[PDB]
């Protein structure tokens with residue numbers, strides 16, 4: 861499959877928008893994790909490949925995703941990072957799990973079409 865980056869933007873962006881609409885659950889994911897602001901100086905040791913919603917949006921706007929799985933891989937990276945770093949009892953871990961449930965529902969049909 862050859863992929864049109866504006867046709868992929870139009871197909872994929874509503875799945876990203878689905879994640880942004882979740883409030884409060886998307887709030888920690890809207891900008892890059894800032895370890896200084898959050899007081900978590902080991903974050904970049906543990907999380908080698910950070911990702912967040914703003915980064916995925918800018919990637920999709922600059923035509924960075926040659927094919928849709930690369931996009932799906934970034935969304936999962938963002939989730940896996942938050943699950944790796946955070947305790948299971950934490951607000952952000954539980955928000956991650958909600959976002960992942962939303963994403964799975966949204967992306968399923970879109971990757972079909």
Ligand SMILES: Cc1noc(C)c1-c1ccc2c(c1)nc(CCc1ccccc1)n2CCN1CCOCC1
Pocket residue numbers: 887888889891893897898900941942945946952
């Ligand atoms: C994502 C992710 N992965 O690991 C952590 C830790 C986060 C993360 C990532 C971000 C998190 C956050 C947790 N909790 C909050 C709000 C509470 C807070 C805690 C300490 C200091 C200040 C606030 N935010 C901050 C959310 N703000 C909202 C407004 O825009 C900037 C980020």
